[model samples]
Target chain A: STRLKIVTIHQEPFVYVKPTMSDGTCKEEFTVNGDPVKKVICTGPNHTVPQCCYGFCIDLLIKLARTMNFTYEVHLVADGKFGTQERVKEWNGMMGELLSGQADMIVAPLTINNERAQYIEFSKPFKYQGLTILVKKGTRITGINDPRLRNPSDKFIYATVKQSSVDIYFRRQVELSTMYRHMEKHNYESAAEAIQAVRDNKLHAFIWDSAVLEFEASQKCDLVTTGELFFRSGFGIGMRKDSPWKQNVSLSILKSHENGFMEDLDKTWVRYQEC
Target chain B: STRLKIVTIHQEPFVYVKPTMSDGTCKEEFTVNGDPVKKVICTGPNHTVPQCCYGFCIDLLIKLARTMNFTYEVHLVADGKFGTQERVKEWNGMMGELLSGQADMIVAPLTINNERAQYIEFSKPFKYQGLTILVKKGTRITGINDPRLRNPSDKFIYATVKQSSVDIYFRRQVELSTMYRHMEKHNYESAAEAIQAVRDNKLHAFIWDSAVLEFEASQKCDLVTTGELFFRSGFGIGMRKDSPWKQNVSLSILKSHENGFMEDLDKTWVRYQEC
Candidate 1:
């Protein structure tokens, strides 16, 4: 019985921790900050099924484990970060763990890219998504270059998650024109903080993947998506460059898709419902 | 050389017939009725690397053929229909061709469903899409059950392609009695007709897959999308249940995705640019 170490981030509806009681009952209450502060108990993956720590990726990992006949130990990425390449060519967070051999696999919505490809292998994409802008409802900002956004003195602060592809996209837009000069860039430690800034009027808008923003927007009344999706990309499971599980996991993804398991999971966790 | 007979529909940017000139160049003119009626000519598939017939599916089939080391003959569905299961347990159009051995494969965006799965095998989905409503630029219909649409004699005619999942979805909505009774259902023979009806003001709105409607809306002025995507589904290549090429074609699709070929095609043909 092989047990693989898996890394993930606590992104809502993708992967998150759920608290359970000492008697093995699931706890449904959360703190004011939405964290489960009670006794954290998971009776292992089999007994817990989808309730221990669940989301689209968690359920996907469970299906893959069943199909490939392997067990996995799930670990949250330290610092709650999705890693990015630093100037020194170092990686951080779950990507860092996979690169440093601290984890054998990553079962989160990690974007597939060339830089990461140099350090790790990726399974076939489980989801296709794109970058889009989210703004507070009734905001005058219609797109990246509305005439209302012309003056730097207006302080149009744009927030996004630090080290994420959204940060890179913002930089590219800046390079494209000084029209982006009025738009000051601020990177938050997490998506929630970035979105919170926009809600509190501390930031004018936030740019991130539609996957996360759409879910957040549906849950919150203040946020709404604007403009077209700018950059299309795919999300894949990450593994060590020479990991033996890569082929098997990739095969399992294809099988899951063929059997409609991936589609069902997507409908359950990701699809928007009348919002 | 193994030559597979592939069936497709002439939907714009998917699989449309291109007329060629004797000087070895392609002509890009259409009549007022949108018919290619100057001079009919095809250089034949053997003479053309991708063939005179062109669009997203054509290029995809070309890539699959090249990768799987097989040749194919492209044929338009005789009745220009995508085929649906009838009450008598018989399929019609391209699905019918595949079932009756008139075609070996289908290279169009035929949707995969359980009703059709009994008779045909499907290659892994090449595109994921969802149903959405398309309305004229000034129309007020926002969603399936907007309170503005509570009357029965409003003559709110909603058009959709006949025998499509959109049709099924609309029927289900009517059954749910969510003010769909006021809306009259009109089925068109093709997506172009359905969308054209909205543009001409002959129909109040059209509901169809976002994939097709988005492209149509982008190309046609005076039309826009309203509401969220309501139903998620996938489009796959359909084949006979006992077809031996299923696995090979599926493998080729996965390979094409990993190598960025599919992404390039999507950007080239299907991606929506600013209207």
Candidate 2:
């Protein structure tokens, strides 16, 4: 059987890592560098807190590996991003791995959009999500183009994880020119950092995926999603442009969707979060 | 110039050919084939009617051709059907043409479904439509599975164009087992024939696409659409997997959608049908 090199970026509920249990010896389903657990663990946080990886996508990868009969090596994106036009020149993250043939696929909360799709093909979406604005309990963000956030005069500093879908969206949008410019100067390296800034009131807002925001919002009562979902789109599994698995892999997703398995996984992961 | 060969099946307002002006030379726009309008003209009624072609997809194809700087030869699918598995085995219609490299792409209202997608890739959707039920003025057809039609005992006959998306849908559905079986032996060769059968009271119902049914229903006053849309999906441009134009062509469609060109075209074509 061919060994697939799987990649992802650490985003909560979809893909993330936490400190290992007391013994760090309770698991073996995941493959890291042809062994166990090291392939997909988040290195940034792993050094400080965790040794194992698990989430909606990790579970999905396990199910698909079993269904499709392929062994895999999963790991976090090296650049700590989903991907971007700026980084695509040299390339890094899941997109980079795919472009360079260093990895065969990516299983994470990567948004499906025109720019990225030009470089790679994605499976039928496992989840549908969109942009959302998260603000602290006493702050406000009421719409896609909320003046409080858009107006530079107000000096409300907001940011998103660098080179993620939200970052790319703001970068490409002309309407959000000033806002993107403002965030460009201050965006963090991960959702955790951006959301943390919002939680501590050091940042006015954190704009990212609605589904991810929902889970974190539920877990942290102080953080609340305030705007309507925007740019609604699918989060698809990534593969090379013409990989033979394009059909085989995507087909399983369709069957999973048709049979309602994705919904169950979605509900299970997002609903059961720490408060 | 990479003169692409385009193929399609006649489906009103989307991909249909009609009588050319009496002169046979209204000058030029669509290249049916090198010299003139022979390549893409519809064959059936065309023998009884006239020559030349025009429709929404035809217009879109022309726009894309100019935008992308390519010359193209357009023609109707040889078998007069869109494409389906039954015929795909031996090969016929647009699917066969692409499979055999006889055609470069298909510009028609082709539904983006999982099965067909395995053999080909589709451009971003130019239109979104779904299943609808059409019946005569006094007939009863009120839901996706109206008991009047779903019940085998009633023996009321209904049919759709052979090998179309609607036909494939019923063929794949188990809940509509009896209804599908009843129609299998009674289906017509073309949408015109099926809709005519309903209009003439020979056929009790015609199950087809929502957009096409809406246009015909508006034109015939004697016919009406009952039941809401079902199996909603996008109708995308058809191309072979890994086709280079996949990105270029699809990108244009996305830009067209973003700029609202598709909406205007949809209104002009469907809203202006002959009554």
Candidate 3:
């Protein structure tokens, strides 16, 4: 193919719009494109910096771009805006676009659950994403730190993105709690909205991935986590099962990872995971 | 035989005077006689208030006093002043006080190195004390995190209490440095004097025990340590060899340790081993 196709979901600080200088012309630069980007996020929709991308899948995709030495552009769409029914229908449509040679690859921060993997061939996992709880500031629920606040009660209401691994784990953490009856799940367009609801005190808390919760917390939101990662899931680049470029992309990712290029991206772009 | 004679050393925050009611007196009083008396440093030439007492030893002794049903008192001495041969000679002569029955016990923060242990009967170690380095607020010299600024011509002066364990370790660290000859050691009388030199930039850094260095650092004196304990040494209570009460005091220390009393003291006491 003459053109390299890259698709990303809109999340901030990873793949976002920033001003760049091009031949004496100040133009909107797609900062941190898959080819020459910095920053590492885990698998999930970043609730904070919705403009900046932050997820492990995007990170791995960027790593793959760096390794493969190919010039590429990016495409993004709002994640969690579509559910399983909508997603299955959307995937069916994407398959047509992909086969018709309009899109070369799909590399969004997509979760690689068993159901999704059955339809699409996925790259090796970049990193795991798990569910966490975000609570309002100074709320009686001081998180797992307090003994009394354990055991989800009838007074508690939780939110999670539909079909996200966080949604699955949230259900699990709550089911094991003593007060599962009061635990109601509210579906949001994205995990970021759920976190916003918690920040506004409209919701008691929202169960989401640690990365999204952390991203949201950094954005001047008055939400804190319950210090638990309840769910576990990995992020992978999705491609049509019949795509011929799968092996090449996977090899590129492996080489970049082994050569420490991905680590450099991680250090330059992310601060939360600094050791 | 019923009357017990003892000597003690006075040090600040450990053996200073405070307002209290005398035993068996209903009225609140501040009599010097009944105030927590010392069994060591009972009498000496200098009567400085807030002198350095053997804090760790006193903790162990408190348990002994309770078990033996005996009263105790501590005393203070200037240790004559440092650096001069006269002061070292005076320290040797003070041992005679216990031998001649002028004092029965010697509980002080005396260095119980190999040379001193040979001359007196010392109690089991009450605390682990080790050598460490304290540098000016932002001086970059750490044990593990190598900045790798290895310049042989980089002149650095290290200060320490004359002939202290810190002096030993500082020399060792400097020897391993490629810039060995660039580092020199200066001895002072007290930890305050050594630390003062570093503050004034007269010396680049100084070394001392982790406990004493932490105490000095807490004064907001614009000094910080690399937070490494270089070598292992201990502080012990000293008594005349073959004293009848030597075994009794040591046994009492062991008992207090077993009963969690010493552990409680360690928790409550600000014993930072990080330099």
Q: Pick the candidate with the highest lDDT.
A: 2
TM-scores for chain A, candidates in order? Answer: 0.78, 0.77, 0.66
Residue B11 Cα positional deviation in candidate 3, in Å, after optimal superposition: 3.4
Q: What would the TM-score be for candidate 3 when compared with the true structure?
A: 0.40
* Interface RMSD, every prediction, one decimal place: 8.9, 4.7, 23.6
Candidate 2 per-residue lDDT, tens place, B1-275, comes to 56788877777777656655567533365332343322244433444443566778887888798898888877777767677666326546788788889889988888776777778888866776667888987777776558877774436788888876677667765667887887888889988888898888888888888878988987898898887556655678889987888778877875665444665566556764454
Top model number, DockQ: 2
For residues A174-206, what per-residue lDDT tens digits would candidate 3 score against the true structure? 223433233333467776677667877677877
> lDDT tens string, model 3, B108-134?
555445444445666544554555677
- Residue B247, candidate 1: alpha-carbon lDDT: 60
DockQ winner between candidates 2 and 3:
2
The candidates, ranked best first by TM-score, are: 2, 1, 3
| Model 2 CA lDDT for position A50 | 36
Candidate 2, residue B186: how far the Cα is off, in Å: 14
Candidate 1, residue A153: CA error in Å? 12
Compared with the true structure, what per-residue lDDT tens digits does model 1 show for residues A246-273?
6567666655554456766776777665
DockQ of candidate 3 relative to the true structure? 0.01
